[PDB]
């Protein structure tokens, strides 16, 4: 399995090394054959003699142009004559490329900012994270001592917790008595112990949570403070720090630093991104949290070190449990994109497609356009973004079927050949004009993007076919993660067209897909009402709900299957409209806020929602019971229990802490009322101001009719 690629300079010559676990042992390959390059397009091949003598300077050693060959590539669907400029070392390119573009006879410069390490993977066709070998993993986290005002990492570390397969142990420094805790000498010996623990297992993945911005920076500052080489790279090197724009990143050479925070950030939307909230959002188990003030109160005194050590151990366990969950799906993404798991885990969705396009561009000899210059980069961000959802029909509806579009936006791209190269082509025999926006796209020749897109969907079906007829469940899990990965990549193409930093940027293509998306739904938002009964209630992009009014619960299903076979033969090729599921009593209030049922309970969704109890008492009556007023009639009967001071009050309690911080000033942490106590009347405001969202959000009669 290829883990990563980079280069070392040897005698001023670059040497690509391919870190790869082959069989059960780690291995380093070496390739001194490879050499960097970029392209130049010029007026006449006369000045190629003048441009070869363009020289720059790096480290007081003059930079030269090594060799040059003339190659032919198709750029914007038409072949071009560009020159492949070779050089000796990779860092020669940033020092001379602007001076070659500086030449008056050179028109433009191409493929000059691709990292040398990643360029090698593309041009050599080497796909990372391939094969059936298995990677050793170990998760570790550090818990330290904190004081305000003090600079970063001034205080020492208290215990390094590490979790591998076969258990989670904790190395420490003070004396705590637990079967999974190791004490030794000082803060220095515990590092050399942990550095010993790491190399003994020799893992391929060092799993961390927020390790790019906390753990490694903290470990490094104190290691140099105590004069110890932090040997973590399998070649004896120390973890390198990348700039990565705003925040920083850390890589361990020979291994894969898998920071969970960036990947958790991409796939989940949470109010706070703490390990405890992340652990239960992914697995459902609560996780106790020991704070920075409690951790700096136990060690300094020695009182109750039983919890400060056990919290770090659990931090290690869940970071391993999360990494073991999220890494297998992130490995197929790297094998799909063709970059290291390190590069892929910290990449935005748009840059994932960019890496994937550069790969396909090289195989198909497509010259890659350049990144935007800074003037046009600020010009692309001003672009108007417009997506609209028709307002949902209000009321209570039953016997509903939800119809869904099979990959609407990518299917629009392949059918109409939506691409920057086919855009406004000259002299073509057939065009497709987009609705309202009016862009033309040639159809005689397939575009670069739509050709690749069709090769992705027609590669996911061929994989979903193979998921069945495979017996090993872990093998079905491999194909399950890849097919689920192709869909995300394909759905990122429409967003890539609007991506500002994108190379294959085409705002004309993006507006067309939205217009075609709007045209195709509204065409089928009707066409079902005029010919098949069936008036629609809710309708977002790629999906709409519909039902026949006052029809049988089964007749709608039998009528829903008839319309599908009709428009599926009416729509173009890739446009497939599919059947998702059946629903009974359901209501819709403004776009994107809805709650329905199926046929056996279970609130299909909420998308909108003491009071935690009252709100669930409004939902079930509105859907399962389906009575009209009742829910309004019921909440009006909360004042009879709450404002009358006659409902069990010890639920008024807000068990959530960090009225605000005044009870802490009063207690110079559950509470209800500047009180704790309890066992004397409560407040006449919570009954309305805390149940208003339990009603007004869902109930849209008079909001004071419940008062």
Domains of the chain: 1-130+348-368 (3.30.342.10), 131-347 (3.30.420.10), 369-446+500-606 (3.90.1600.10), 447-499 (1.10.287.690), 607-707 (no CATH)
Q: How far apart are alpha carbons 493 and 488 in whole angstroms?
A: 9
d(CA 356, CA 387): 27
User: How many helices, marked H, and strands, marked E, lie in the chain?
Assistant: 22, 26
Q: Token pair for residue 258? A: 């898998």
Phi, psi of 31 (to 5 degrees): -140, 100
Is residue 327 classed as helix, strand or coil in its secondary structure?
A: helix
Euclidean distance between the first and final Cα of the chain, in Å?
66
Strand-pair category, 56-58 with 25-31: unpaired
CB-based burial of residue 629 (10 Å sphere; 0-12 exposed, 13-18 middle, 19+ buried)? exposed
- The resolution in Å comes to 2.8
- The burial class, CB within 10 Å (0-12 / 13-18 / 19+), for 124 is middle
> Phi and psi dihedrals of 152, rounded to 5?
-70, 135
Instruction: Locate 214 and state its tokens.
Output: 């906390």
Strand partners for 14: 9
Pair of tokens at residue 628: 């009209």
What is the rounded (10 degree) CA torsion for 55, 60, 66, 71? -60
What CA–CA distance (Å, rounded) separates 127 from 174? 47
Structure-determination approach:
X-ray
For 338, the token pair is 């063709």
d(CA 77, CA 124): 24
Residue 366 phi, psi dihedral angles, 5° rounding: -95, 120
Report residue 96 CA to chain centroid gap: 36
Tokens of 303: 């009182």
Q: What is the CB neighbour count within 10 angstroms for residue 572?
A: 12
- Which DSSP state fits 366? B
Classify strands 61-63 and 56-58 as parallel, antiparallel or unpaired.
antiparallel
Identify the sign of the CA torsion 43, 46, 52, 53. negative
Interacting residues of 503 by C-beta distance below 8 A, sequence separation 6+: 354, 357, 368, 369, 370, 371
3-state secondary structure of 461: helix
Identify whether the C-beta of residue 63 lies closer than 8 Å to the C-beta of residue 96. yes
Say how far apart CA 599 and CA 624 lie, in whole Å.
9
Residue 357 · residue 371 · CB < 8 Å: no
The answer to whether 568 touches 579, Cβ cutoff 8 Å, is no
CB-based contact 136:204 (threshold 8 Å)? yes
Within 8 A by CB and 6+ apart from 654, the residues are: 670, 671, 672
Helix (H, G, I), strand (E, B), or coil: what is residue 82? strand
Bridging pattern class, strands 167-172 and 181-183: parallel
**Contact (Cβ atoms closer than 8 angstroms) between residue 473 and residue 464:** no
* Beta carbons within 10 angstroms of residue 651's beta carbon: 14
The DSSP annotation for 580-594 comes to EEEE-SEEE-STT-E
Length of the chain: 707
In angstroms, rounded to a whole number, what is the distance separating the alpha carbons of residues 72 and 615?
Answer: 67
């Amino acid at each position: 399995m290829i883990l990563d690629t980079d280069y070392i300079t040897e005698d001023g010559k670059p040497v690509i090394r391919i870190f790869k676990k082959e069989n059960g042992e780690f291995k380093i390959e070496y390739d001194r054959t490879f050499e960097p390059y970029f392209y130049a397009l010029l007026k006449d091949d006369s000045a190629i003699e003048e441009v070869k003598k363009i020289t720059a300077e790096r480290h007081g050693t003059v930079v030269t142009v090594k060799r040059v060959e003339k190659v032919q590539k198709k750029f914007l669907g038409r072949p071009v004559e560009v020159w492949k400029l070779y050089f000796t070392h990779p860092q020669d390119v940033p020092a001379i490329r602007d001076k070659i573009r500086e030449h008056p006879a050179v028109i433009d410069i191409y493929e000059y900012d691709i990292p040398f390490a990643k360029r090698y993977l593309i041009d050599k066709g080497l796909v990372p994270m391939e094969g059936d070998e298995e990677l050793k993993m170990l998760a570790f986290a550090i818990a330290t001592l904190y004081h305000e005002g003090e600079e970063f990492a001034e205080g020492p570390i208290l215990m390094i917790s590490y979790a591998d397969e076969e258990g989670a142990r904790v190395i420490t420094w003070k004396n705590v008595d637990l079967p999974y805790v190791d004490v030794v000498s000082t803060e220095r010996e515990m590092i050399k112990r942990f550095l010993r623990v790491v190399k003994e297992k020799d893992p391929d993945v060092l799993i961390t949570y927020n390790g790019d911005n906390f753990d490694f920076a903290y470990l490094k500052k104190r290691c140099e403070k105590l004069g110890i080489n932090f040997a973590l790279g399998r070649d004896g090197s120390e973890p390198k720090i990348q700039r990565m724009g705003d925040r920083f990143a850390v890589e361990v050479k020979g291994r894969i630093h898998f920071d969970l925070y960036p990947v958790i950030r991409r796939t989940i939307n949470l109010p706070t991104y703490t390990l405890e909230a992340v652990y239960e959002a992914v697995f459902g188990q609560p996780k106790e949290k020991v704070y920075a003030e409690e951790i700096t109160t136990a060690w300094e005194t020695g009182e109750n070190l039983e919890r400060v050590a056990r919290y770090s151990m659990e931090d290690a366990k869940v970071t391993y449990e999360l990494g073991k969950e999220f890494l297998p799906m992130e490995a197929q993404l790297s094998r799909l994109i063709g970059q290291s798991l390190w590069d892929v885990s910290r990449s935005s969705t748009g840059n994932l497609v960019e890496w994937f396009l550069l790969r396909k561009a090289y195989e198909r000899n497509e010259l890659a356009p350049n990144k935007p210059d800074e003037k046009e980069l600020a010009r692309r961000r001003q672009s108007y973004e417009g997506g609209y959802v028709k307002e949902p029909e209000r009321g209570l509806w039953e016997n509903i079927v939800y119809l869904d579009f099979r990959s609407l936006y990518p299917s629009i791209i392949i059918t109409h050949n939506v691409s920057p190269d086919t855009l406004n082509r000259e002299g073509c025999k057939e065009y497709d004009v987009a609705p309202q926006v009016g862009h033309r796209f040639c159809k005689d020749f397939p575009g670069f993007i739509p050709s690749l897109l069709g090769d992705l969907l027609e590669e996911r079906q061929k994989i979903k076919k193979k998921m069945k007829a495979t017996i090993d469940p872990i093998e079905r899990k491999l194909l399950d993660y890849r097919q689920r990965r192709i869909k995300i990549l394909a759905n990122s193409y429409y967003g890539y067209y609007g991506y500002a930093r994108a190379r294959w940027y085409c705002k004309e293509c993006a507006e067309s897909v939205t217009a075609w998306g709007r045209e195709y739904i509204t065409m089928t938002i009707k066409e079902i009402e005029e010919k098949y009964g069936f008036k629609v209630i809710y309708s977002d992009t790629d999906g709409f709900f519909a039902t026949i009014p006052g029809a049988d619960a089964e007749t709608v299903k039998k009528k829903a299957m008839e319309f599908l076979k009709y428009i599926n033969a009416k729509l173009p090729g890739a446009l497939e409209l599919e059947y998702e599921g059946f629903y009974k009593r359901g209501f819709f209030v403004t776009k994107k806020k809805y709650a329905v049922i199926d046929e056996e309970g279970k609130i299909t969704t909420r998308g909108l929602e003491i009071a935690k109890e009252t709100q669930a008492r409004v939902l079930e009556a509105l859907l399962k019971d389906g009575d009209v007023e009742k829910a309004v009639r019921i909440v009006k009967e909360v004042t009879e229990k709450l404002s009358k001071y006659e409902v069990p009050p010890e639920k008024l309690v807000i068990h959530i802490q960090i009225p605000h911080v005044a009870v802490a000033k009063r207690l110079a942490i559950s509470y209800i009322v500047r009180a704790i106590e309890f066992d004397k009347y409560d407040a006449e405001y919570y009954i309305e101001n805390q149940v208003l969202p339990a009603v007004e959000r869902i109930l849209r009669y008079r909001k004071e009719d419940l008062r």
